[PDB]
Paper text:
The X-ray structure of jsAFP in the Ca2+-bound state was determined with preparation of its crystal in a solution composed of 0.1 M sodium acetate buffer (pH 7.0), 0.2–0.25 M ammonium sulfate, 8% PEG 3350, and 2 mM CaCl2. The overall structure of the Ca2+-bound jsAFP is composed of two alpha-helices (α1 and α2), eight beta-strands (β1–β8) and four loop regions (L1: C69–W75, L2: W77–T81, L3: C89–Q92, L4: D94–E99). The molecule is further stabilized by five disulfide-bonds (C4–C15, C32–C125, C69–C100, C89–C111 and C101–C117) and a hydrophobic core composed of aromatic and aliphatic residues. A Ca2+ ion was located at the molecular surface between β7 and a loop segment L3–L4 of jsAFP, and was coordinated with the side-chain oxygen atoms of Q92, D94 E99, D113, D114, a backbone oxygen atom of D114, and an oxygen atom of a water molecule. Significantly, a total of 16 waters are organized into an ice-like arrangement on the putative IBS (left). They construct at least five pentagonal rings (PI~PV) and one hexagonal ring (HI) that are next to each other, in which a few oxygen atoms of the side-chain groups of jsAFP are also involved. The side-chain OH-groups of T96 and T98 are therefore thought to play a crucial role to anchor the water molecules via hydrogen-bonds, and function as a scaffold for the polypentagonal formation. The obtained docked model showed that waters 1, 3, 4, 5, 6, 10 (cyan) as well as the side-chain oxygen atoms of D94 and E99 perfectly match to the waters constructing the 1st prism plane, whose RMSD was less than 1.0 Å. The B-factors along the sequence of the Ca2+-bound jsAFP (cyan line) is lower than that of the Ca2+-free form (orange line), suggesting that 1 mol of Ca2+-binding rigidifies the overall structure of jsAFP. Indeed, the IBS of most the AFPs tends to be hydrophobic. It is speculated that the Ca2+ ion in the jsAFP structure plays a role to neutralize the electric charge of the acidic residues of the IBS, which increases its hydrophobicity to lead and organize the polypentagonal ice-like waters.
Numbering used by the authors: 3 to 128
The structure:
Amino acid sequence: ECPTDWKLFDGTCYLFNPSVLHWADAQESCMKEGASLASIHSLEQYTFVKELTTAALTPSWLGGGDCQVSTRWFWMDGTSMDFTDWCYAQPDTTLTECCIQMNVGVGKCWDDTPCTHLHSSICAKT
Ligand SMILES: [Ca+2]
């Protein structure tokens, strides 16, 4: 039920893009194949997504941030910010590091990151 290479979890198709890109390049790459950088809304979705990110659980971009107004988090896929997994000392909430990166540090958790940093990414389409 997903296109070749994409992986199904509860009605949504996901793809890991290993190419290291800034957040906007990563979003554009998802969009070229009809997708967005992913959102996360449950523990099971989160585990499924982590399992796409190589054995290394590579630090990766998600489709979230607070880049318009600090502390106001939004996803790119029309869903709301509900579930989060902030690392200790996150989020900073500063506009200079406003894009959400997952798989950060030993704890494999979220950190609001300068959007120009280069990371792999997770795309999703439903
Ligand atoms: Ca941060």
